[PDB]
Design an enzyme around this catalytic site. Structure first.
Site, mmCIF file in Angstrom:
data_model
loop_
_atom_site.group_PDB
_atom_site.id
_atom_site.type_symbol
_atom_site.label_atom_id
_atom_site.label_comp_id
_atom_site.label_asym_id
_atom_site.label_seq_id
_atom_site.Cartn_x
_atom_site.Cartn_y
_atom_site.Cartn_z
ATOM 1 N N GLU A 164 0.863 -1.212 0.000
ATOM 2 C CA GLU A 164 0.000 0.000 0.000
ATOM 3 C C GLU A 164 0.892 1.253 0.000
ATOM 4 O O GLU A 164 1.899 1.300 0.697
ATOM 5 C CB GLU A 164 -0.871 -0.068 1.251
ATOM 6 C CG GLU A 164 -1.618 1.229 1.607
ATOM 7 C CD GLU A 164 -2.455 1.170 2.860
ATOM 8 O OE1 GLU A 164 -2.866 0.037 3.173
ATOM 9 O OE2 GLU A 164 -2.727 2.265 3.492
ATOM 10 N N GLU B 204 -3.402 11.026 4.042
ATOM 11 C CA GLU B 204 -4.415 10.796 5.033
ATOM 12 C C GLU B 204 -4.483 12.076 5.850
ATOM 13 O O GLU B 204 -3.475 12.552 6.372
ATOM 14 C CB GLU B 204 -4.183 9.600 5.988
ATOM 15 C CG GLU B 204 -3.939 8.322 5.260
ATOM 16 C CD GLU B 204 -3.703 7.190 6.259
ATOM 17 O OE1 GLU B 204 -2.523 6.837 6.379
ATOM 18 O OE2 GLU B 204 -4.688 6.752 6.972
#
Ligand code: CA
Length: 330
Positions: free
Chosen positions: A145, A150
């Site tokens: 990933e 974020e």
């Protein structure tokens, strides 16, 4: 054909000597068409699924709904809304269930994939609301990933105190990636660079900037090779991880250059010496995670009903490029 929305905005990474960037069409979109909110599973423009990659409706009191994704007014809209229904969810830190008013939310997953060498960038307007606004990529097997962004939104309406205050969270952009191991076990391993692993600077912020929610931002990653990632915010380099070395701009603008005694992409060698190689889908979503929601970092009714247009993560464009050798006079 008119120039795309990103035309005239240079790609901030360098593709290599005697190379140029080539747009990857199947993963690029400037969202200047109408796609009304739809309750049914749909690949928008043939490229963007209006849901998560299976029927799971999300973490915490999140309820991902197909009809909470639309395209209008020059951007994809990833909408938070509240119908009053409750959702019961597990606190990941101790295994217990809790119930809260749910928030219906959106999640988008690409049809296509990217693989190194590739530059991926989105122009987003982070919601001025208390929830996670995420841009990230993951391999089909969930083992590898990359987290482009974020971020936890805005500060909310007045009246928040204690753990419900969102100021620390709102000022940051998390720049990271994960490699997993043994996902067949319950206690699977997850390596990401972070302070506790001896890799600093992963929670990017700038002295003076309280949040990222009042304007569009561009966030992108150059996934150059299996041991090399570079991150760019608003067209400017902010962070590189390269083998055992990494460097970044700190919150005061200072360049920090660091050298670890281990590979900072795959510290515990969960990739059997290969690094980050697996093709990845792009995911753009909003969520209310358990840890945040239980702390009160979760939209109030006053916020979500009083400022509905702020409870939307907007995507002006996504663009993807891969390096090609220069072609000469044609
Ligand atoms: Ca647009």
């Amino acid at each position: 054909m008119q120039a795309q929305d990103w035309a005239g905005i240079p790609v901030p990474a360098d593709p290599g000597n005697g190379k140029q960037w080539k747009l990857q069409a199947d993963m690029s979109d400037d969202f200047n068409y109408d796609f009304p909110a739809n309750k049914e599973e749909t690949y928008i423009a043939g490229k963007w699924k209006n849901f998560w990659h299976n029927s799971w409706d999300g973490p915490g009191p999140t309820q991902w709904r197909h009809e909470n994704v639309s395209v209008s007014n020059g951007h994809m809209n990833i909408v938070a809304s509240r119908n009053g229904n409750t959702k019961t969810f597990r606190n990941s830190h101790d295994g217990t269930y809790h119930t809260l008013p749910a928030t219906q939310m959106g999640c988008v997953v690409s049809k296509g994939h990217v693989q190194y060498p590739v530059f991926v960038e989105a122009r987003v307007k982070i919601a001025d609301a208390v929830f996670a606004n995420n841009v990230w990529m993951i391999s089909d097997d969930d083992y590898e990933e990359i987290d482009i962004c974020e971020n936890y939104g805005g500060l909310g309406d007045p009246g928040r105190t204690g753990t419900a205050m969102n100021a620390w969270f709102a000022k940051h952009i998390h720049l990271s990636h994960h490699v997993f191991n043994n996902r067949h076990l319950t206690n699977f391993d997850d390596y990401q660079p972070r302070d506790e692993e001896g890799v600093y600077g992963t929670w990017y912020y700038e002295n003076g900037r309280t949040d990222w929610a009042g304007e569009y931002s561009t966030i992108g990653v150059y996934w150059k090779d299996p041991n090399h990632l570079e991150y760019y915010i608003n067209g400017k380099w902010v962070r590189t991880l390269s083998g055992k070395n990494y460097s970044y701009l700190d919150p005061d603008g200072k360049l920090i250059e660091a050298s670890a005694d281990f590979n900072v992409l795959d510290k515990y060698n969960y990739t059997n010496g290969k690094g980050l190689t697996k093709p990845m889908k792009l995911i753009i979503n909003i969520e209310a995670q358990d840890w945040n929601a239980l702390a009160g970092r979760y939209p109030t009714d006053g916020e979500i009903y009083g400022r509905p247009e702020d409870h939307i993560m907007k995507v002006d464009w996504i663009r993807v490029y891969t390096p090609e050798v220069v072609t000469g006079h044609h």
